C-alpha cells in the first residue's frame, strides 16, 4: 500500500485593491489535514483532520510562518509573470503550485514532485530525477536559468527525499486508525426500465477509501464498453468516496451482465449480478 503527501497552493490576483487571495491545502493520500485561507480571520495554518491536532504550538507557529512566506512568494510571482507575459494590471491571474512525495509499501521514498502553473497552463516542473526542470515556454526558460544558477533543484531534492518523507511517516503513525485503514466499497445494483425492451443496470460503489477504484461491466464474461456510462469518482463529504457505472441492456437479458469491482480494500475483486 503506497502513500503520498501533497500540498496545493492557489493565488488569485485581485486587481483594483489589495493582495491576492491565497489558499493552501495539505493532503495525506485522499485526506486533507491542513489549510490556510488568506480571507479567514485566524491567519494561521489550521487543522483539518483530528490526528494533526496532536501537534503542538511549535508545529502550528512553524507551519504558519512558512505558509505566509509561500503567500508572499506567489504575490511576487504574480507580478513577475505579468511582466514576463506583458499583461496589464486590469485582469485577474492565477498561480498554482503543487509539491510532495510518494512512498511505496515500505514507506520509503518512491517519487518527488514540484510543479507550477500560470493561468491553468504548465509553467515549470521539476523532472522525475529531481535534478532538472521542464520549462513550457520562454518565460519559464528564464525562471529555469535563474533556478539552475541558484541550485534550487538540490535544495528541493533534500526536502522531497528527506523531510517530506519523515513528516509522511510521522503522519501515517499518528493517524494510523484512519490513514492506515482501507474502506472497501459497499456495493449494490439498481435496475431501471427505460421502455418495454430496454433496461439500465447501475452498479454502485459507496463509502470507499482510498478514492482509487475500478468498475467494469462484462457481458457473458467479456468486457463491455459500448452502451456503458461511468461517473467521475466523487467525495461523499465524510472522508469517503462514491462511484457508479451503468450499462444499457435488452430487457430480460440482465443475467448476462456482471459488474466487476477492484479496490485496495478488497483482497479479491468483487462480482455483482442482477
Amino acid at each position: 500500500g503506497s502513500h503520498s503527501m501533497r500540498y496545493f497552493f492557489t493565488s488569485v490576483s485581485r486587481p483594483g485593491r489589495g493582495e491576492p487571495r491565497f489558499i493552501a491545502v495539505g493532503y495525506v493520500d485522499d485526506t486533507q489535514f491542513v489549510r490556510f485561507d488568506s480571507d479567514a480571520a485566524s491567519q494561521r495554518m489550521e487543522p483539518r483532520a483530528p490526528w494533526i491536532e496532536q501537534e503542538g504550538p511549535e508545529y502550528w507557529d512553524g507551519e504558519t510562518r512558512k505558509v505566509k512566506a509561500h503567500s508572499q512568494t506567489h504575490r511576487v510571482d504574480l507580478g513577475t509573470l505579468r511582466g514576463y507575459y506583458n499583461q496589464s494590471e486590469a485582469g485577474s491571474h492565477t498561480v498554482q503550485r503543487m509539491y510532495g512525495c510518494d512512498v511505496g509499501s515500505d514507506w520509503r521514498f518512491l517519487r518527488g514532485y514540484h510543479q507550477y502553473a500560470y493561468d491553468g497552463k504548465d509553467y515549470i516542473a521539476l523532472k522525475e530525477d529531481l535534478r532538472s526542470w521542464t520549462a513550457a515556454d520562454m518565460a519559464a526558460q528564464t525562471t529555469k536559468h535563474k533556478w539552475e544558477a541558484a541550485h534550487v533543484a538540490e535544495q528541493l531534492r533534500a526536502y522531497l527525499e528527506g523531510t517530506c518523507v519523515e513528516w509522511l511517516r510521522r503522519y501515517l503513525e499518528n493517524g494510523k486508525e484512519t490513514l492506515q485503514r482501507t474502506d472497501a466499497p459497499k456495493t449494490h445494483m439498481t435496475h431501471h426500465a427505460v421502455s418495454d425492451h430496454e433496461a439500465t443496470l447501475r452498479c454502485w460503489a459507496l463509502s470507499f477509501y482510498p478514492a482509487e477504484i475500478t468498475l467494469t461491466w462484462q457481458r457473458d464474461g467479456e468486457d463491455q464498453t459500448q452502451d456503458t456510462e461511468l461517473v467521475e469518482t466523487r467525495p461523499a463529504g465524510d472522508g469517503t468516496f462514491q462511484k457508479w457505472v451503468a450499462v444499457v441492456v435488452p430487457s430480460g437479458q440482465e443475467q448476462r451482465y456482471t459488474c466487476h469491482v477492484q479496490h485496495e480494500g478488497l483482497p479479491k475483486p468483487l462480482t455483482l449480478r442482477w
Binding site: Q72, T73, W167
Partner: peptide, 9 residues
Amino acid sequence: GILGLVFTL
C-alpha cells in the same frame, strides 16, 4: 510539514 525554502519565479 511544508517546504521551508520558497524561491521566486
